Design a protein around this ligand. Structure first.
Ligand SMILES: Cc1cn([C@H]2C[C@H](O)[C@@H](COP(=O)(O)OP(=O)(O)O[C@H]3O[C@@H](C)[C@H](O)[C@@H](O)[C@H]3O)O2)c(=O)[nH]c1=O
Ligand SMILES: Cc1cn([C@H]2C[C@H](O)[C@@H](COP(=O)(O)OP(=O)(O)O[C@H]3O[C@@H](C)[C@H](O)[C@@H](O)[C@H]3O)O2)c(=O)[nH]c1=O
Lengths: 198, 198
């Protein structure tokens, strides 16, 4: 496996070694040794989630308050999604910036999203299945949303086909980035570095 | 999430709570609290593997020498597979017996296979994708095979079109159950008992 840090520090694109034969294929999606090699610690898998989405569905932008927040190791096992990470860590040299990766069933790449980042994706095909390992169990009181189409964040969603994305009631009602900043819920860059440092 | 122990003790069929909405669906595949509730301890996820198989491909029968062997939390995220667990624990009250779970992208069930059991599946459709969480990283020295079509184990594989299974060179060369019994590589029942007890 190869791991490339994104333009948003603390997020990485992972490339698997896919072993192909006449039967189909095989890959190691995560290994403890492989994960430690880029992250500097083991991933404490406390939950694993799965979602299936039709074309044009946008889920996000989601984060978990620090501490302990929720790191996510995310991949697409059918179809394809345009996946985005946003630096919402107040004080970060890259605060308010975002990066993206294409997660699909062809190249079978992965994004690791460390603690205190925001994350979302737009499904590009019907029946796009996403699985993700989580560093913390579901905590709906500590998990929050930011409007995925926030004009300050200005995420360049490749809308299908420029048509508005289809959102949950939750995500459609998501507050502006401005409002989330006023709430005090965003993690601090210093806090997040210290936390991962420990 | 509901767990039903199979006729082979130490293997469970897990049924998800599937949350359907306008977008598609979401489910919590593993939670720490849910896993502990049936297994009695937390799953130490040290590796996660993915395979994709064409119809009639059989992968198995596979096991890992105890200790620590390798527990597996297995699900099918596209297509469908007939998944089998075999009690290979010498001294077990159910030694030599097997049970099965239908893993597919419809009911989205999971089988948990504890340490010291054998496991395999037969793919029932093309593009069938199986993902499994592992309690131990790949150990080629301590991972072993048993012929999937062994006459004593007599596993009733629902052969696709009645045709012979498509096997890897490793699985096609797998020794008979007899040979494995003589080898000393099988775990003992009370050995698995105290290992999982601890
Ligand atoms: C996130 C989550 C949702 N649910 C349930 C509640 C709802 O009935 C259903 C859908 O919930 P939603 O919050 O709308 O799921 P979603 O698929 O929009 O949320 C996910 O989006 C990703 C982009 C983020 O990276 C994830 O952290 C997560 O927030 O799933 C859980 O049971 N456990 C969970 O951990
Ligand atoms: C199991 C495993 C295999 N491999 C390698 C060896 C091969 O090049 C390629 C495919 O290996 P195979 O042994 O043919 O994979 P397989 O899909 O036949 O093996 C799997 O079958 C399941 C039924 C068992 O429960 C698992 O424990 C595992 O053994 O991947 C790994 O690299 N890591 C692993 O953890």
């Amino acid at each position: 496996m190869k791991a490339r840090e994104l333009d948003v520090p603390g997020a990485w694109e992972i490339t698997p070694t896919i072993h192909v034969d006449s039967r189909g294929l095989f890959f190691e999606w995560l290994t403890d040794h492989g994960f430690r090699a880029f992250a500097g610690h083991s991933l404490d898998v406390r939950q694993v989630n799965c979602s299936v989405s039709s074309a044009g569905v946008l889920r996000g932008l989601h984060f978990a308050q620090l501490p302990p927040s929720q790191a996510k190791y995310v991949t697409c096992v059918s179809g394809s999604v345009f996946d985005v990470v946003v630096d919402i860590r107040e004080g970060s040299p890259t605060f308010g910036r975002w990066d993206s990766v294409l997660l699909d069933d062809q190249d079978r790449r992965t994004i690791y999203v460390s603690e205190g980042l925001a994350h979302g994706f737009l499904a590009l095909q019907d029946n796009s299945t996403v699985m993700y390992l989580c560093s913390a169990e579901y905590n709906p009181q500590r998990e929050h949303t930011i409007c995925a189409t926030d004009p300050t964040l200005a995420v360049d969603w490749p809308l299908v086909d420029g048509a508005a994305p289809s959102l949950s009631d939750r995500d459609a009602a998501a507050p502006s980035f401005e409002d989330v900043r006023a709430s005090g819920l965003l993690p601090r860059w210093e806090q997040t570095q210290r936390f991962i440092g420990e």
